[PDB]
Ligand binder design. Structure first.
Ligand SMILES: Nc1ncnc2c1ncn2[C@@H]1O[C@H](COP(=O)(O)OP(=O)(O)OP(O)(O)=S)[C@@H](O)[C@H]1O
Ligand SMILES: [Mg+2]
Lengths: 134, 350, 160, 37
């Protein structure tokens, strides 16, 4: 009900106060939307095969799908280059760069060949999104 | 009345001659709350109040309207009660849990110093000539409910305790809030069944308004837009359905005071045959499923005439009172019969 | 679809629309963009390849009788508080107009039995206490209710 | 290129780490010296 909307506004204000920002930004709203949604929560998510977390896996999938869908209105190497450009604010060492390269290559291959969300079209194949992912 | 400025009087008169005064008055109540025309209409109509009468000094006819508000949670009933608390010149707010029978009424006490029997007035006594608000009336203990009927019906309390017999005036407008049992109103049951109150208590009430919660995407859009706009407007740093501009709060308060203290309508142009036929139909359709309903409608028409500052009642007041009363009555019936009731009474609802 | 025959059949069906864009004038992006919505439309059917007035009331009453326990019948129809007689009472309650027990309604009942919309349970020789069951999907009854201006959800005990 | 910027940042980080190899207690006492009066 409207009470939850007021709680959402309060959560956005709390996120804004946390970052010492004089104005509220939509990033706070996106952050609070998950926490409002989750409800029942497990102790810990299981690892995904070197192991990576389920939340991080979903985050990477969402980012890559959003970028591909935005570009619709690409190439494997070009998309990897974009991702490395975007994640530049976090990597601080060469070892982290090679680890990120390993992770992104594995994730792209896994999405292509197991989850079928990405479709290969014929060394730098074109990648397209399965038209039934929202 | 003496404190009223002649500028206030001239502004009130200029507002009275407006043909759309009723629309702006109804739209001026609860700007922060969206929709729900019927509830604010009924509360305003009760606030203006009728004319109490004492025919022959044998029986006294009350000029007060009792409103009961049952609604699904999430409809801001407490917000309406708080706004009424603020607006009223004389207002007392009580909660269901914290209101005892001794607290609400006058009680006899021995003075701690001089030790004679003394009377301390209750909330209702201090609500005389004002308005009394009851929150969570469904929480009332039945024993506490027993003392309520006397003040509801006669607007006076007779205290016979410790050898002291006294009578005190209880002319107050009572607004009670309640929640349905189980937290949700069932449309497949009668209004009496959904509320844990006895039939006489409901009978003492004059206007009944039930509010439900429906999942309508367009209504959700309207609610969200209005709420976010209100949130933006009322930030301390930054510090309609009828399409009419709401009146200022002070002007509305002054208008209410002047209308309460000047107008005394006369019912010299009422057609008794139409109301007699309507009441016969009401009996026919109620036995298929009283006089005080007619009295409530009469004082309702008197209040509506007082809204327009008219010394005599025009039949349009009667038509609007009939319309709102019929809307209130059909809302208290089961779903299987309200369609037939609307079809039968489509003449007056149109 | 891992069936070779079915996938090959789908390819044979959809190939002409695959080859239309090049005829109209090796552009992979152009072909995929021109062809994508048709693929989504095709996937909607992978393996797939107006009653009379009183009949609608009979059908909705039969659905209500089948899916509503008898204990709540008066709670939904009695003004103040499965066998054929229950169906007759419910039908009389629902319809606002007085319907005469003409033999044509019995003919409608028998025809609905024939059309495999209502299944007879009891013995064929026992035509004084017959038992029936409704085999109509919920979406179908909701759709037919909309064309009649009737809200069946308000009377379904299970949903409430 | 990104690699050049990252290596420059790593060199700066290593230089600052060599700078902070000095005992942390030296600045902790200095912090307390303002609080003493
Ligand atoms: N229609 C509405 N328009 C604007 N705000 C609303 C509306 N309904 C609810 N709200 C907001 O929701 C808040 C909480 O609502 P409440 O008043 O607690 O709900 P309620 O209907 O009174 O039921 P209870 O008594 O709390 S169980 C209010 O303070 C309002 O700010
Ligand atoms: Mg409340």
């Amino acid at each position: 009900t409207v009470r939850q909307l007021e709680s959402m506004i309060r959560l956005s204000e709390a996120m804004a106060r946390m970052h010492c920002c004089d104005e509220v930004q939509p990033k706070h709203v996106k952050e609070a939307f998950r926490l409002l949604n989750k409800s029942i929560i497990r102790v810990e998510t299981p690892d995904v095969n070197l192991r990576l977390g389920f939340s991080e896996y979903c985050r990477i999938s969402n980012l890559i799908v959003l970028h591909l869908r935005k570009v619709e209105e690409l190439k494997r190497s070009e998309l990897v280059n974009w991702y490395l450009k975007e994640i530049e604010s976090e990597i601080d060492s060469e070892e982290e760069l090679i680890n990120k390269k390993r992770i992104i290559e594995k994730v792209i291959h896994r999405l292509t060949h197991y989850d079928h969300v990405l479709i290969e079209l014929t060394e730098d194949p074109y990648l397209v999104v399965n038209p039934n992912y929202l | 009345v003496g404190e009223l400025t002649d500028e206030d009087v001239k502004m009130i008169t200029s507002l009275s001659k407006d043909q759309q005064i009723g629309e702006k008055i109804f739209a001026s109540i609860a700007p922060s709350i969206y929709g729900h025309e019927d509830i604010k209409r009924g509360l305003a109509l009760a606030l203006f109040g009728g004319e109490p009468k004492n025919p022959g000094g044998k029986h006294k006819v009350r000029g007060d309207i009792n409103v009961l508000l049952c609604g699904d949670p999430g409809t801001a009933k407490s917000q309406f009660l708080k706004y009424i608390e603020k607006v009223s010149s004389r207002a007392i707010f009580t909660t269901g849990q914290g209101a005892s029978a001794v607290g609400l009424t006058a009680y006899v006490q021995r003075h701690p110093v001089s030790r004679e029997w003394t009377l301390e007035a209750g909330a209702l006594v201090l609500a005389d000539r004002g308005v009394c608000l009851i929150d969570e009336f469904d929480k009332m203990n039945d024993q506490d409910r027993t003392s309520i009927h006397e003040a509801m019906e006669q607007q006076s309390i007779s205290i016979s305790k410790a050898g002291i017999v006294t009578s005190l005036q209880a002319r107050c407008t009572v607004i009670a809030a309640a929640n349905p049992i189980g937290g949700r109103y069932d449309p497949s049951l009668t209004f009496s069944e959904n509320v844990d109150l006895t039939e006489p208590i409901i009978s003492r009430f004059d206007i009944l308004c039930v509010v439900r919660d429906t999942v309508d995407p367009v209504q959700d859009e309207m609610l969200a837009r209005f709420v976010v706009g209100s949130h933006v407007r009322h930030h301390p740093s930054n510090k309609n359905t009828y399409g009419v501009e709401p009146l200022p709060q002070e002007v509305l308060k002054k208008y209410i005071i002047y209308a309460k203290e000047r107008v005394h309508p006369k019912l010299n142009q009422m057609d008794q045959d139409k109301v007699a036929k309507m009441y016969s139909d009401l009996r026919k359709e109620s036995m298929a499923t009283t006089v005080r309903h007619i009295e409530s409608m009469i004082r309702m028409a008197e209040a509506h005439a007082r809204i327009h500052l008219r010394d005599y009642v025009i039949e349009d007041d009667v038509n609007m009172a009939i319309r709102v009363m019929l809307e209130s009555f059909i809302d208290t019936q089961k779903f299987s019969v309200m369609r037939s009731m609307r079809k039968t009474f489509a003449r007056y609802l149109s | 679809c891992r069936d070779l025959k079915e996938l090959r059949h789908l390819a044979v069906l959809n190939f002409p629309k695959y080859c239309e864009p090049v005829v109209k004038g090796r552009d992979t992006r152009k072909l995929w963009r021109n062809i994508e919505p048709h693929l989504k439309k095709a996937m909607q059917t992978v393996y797939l390849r107006e009653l009379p007035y009183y009949s609608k009331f009979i059908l909705i009453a039969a659905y209500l009788a089948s899916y509503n326990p008898a204990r709540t019948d008066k709670r939904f129809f009695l003004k103040h508080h499965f066998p054929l007689d229950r169906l007759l009472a419910i039908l009389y309650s629902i319809v606002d107009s007085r319907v005469a027990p003409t033999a044509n309604i019995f003919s409608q009942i028998t025809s609905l039995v024939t059309l495999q919309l209502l299944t007879l349970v009891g013995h064929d020789d026992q035509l004084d206490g017959p038992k029936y069951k409704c085999t109509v999907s919920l979406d179908f009854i909701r759709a037919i209710a909309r064309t009649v201006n009737f809200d069946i959800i308000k009377y379904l005990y299970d949903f409430l | 290129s990104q690699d050049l910027l990252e290596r420059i940042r790593a060199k700066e980080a290593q230089k600052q780490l060599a700078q902070m190899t000095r005992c942390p207690e030296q600045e902790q006492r200095l912090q307390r010296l303002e609080r003493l009066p």
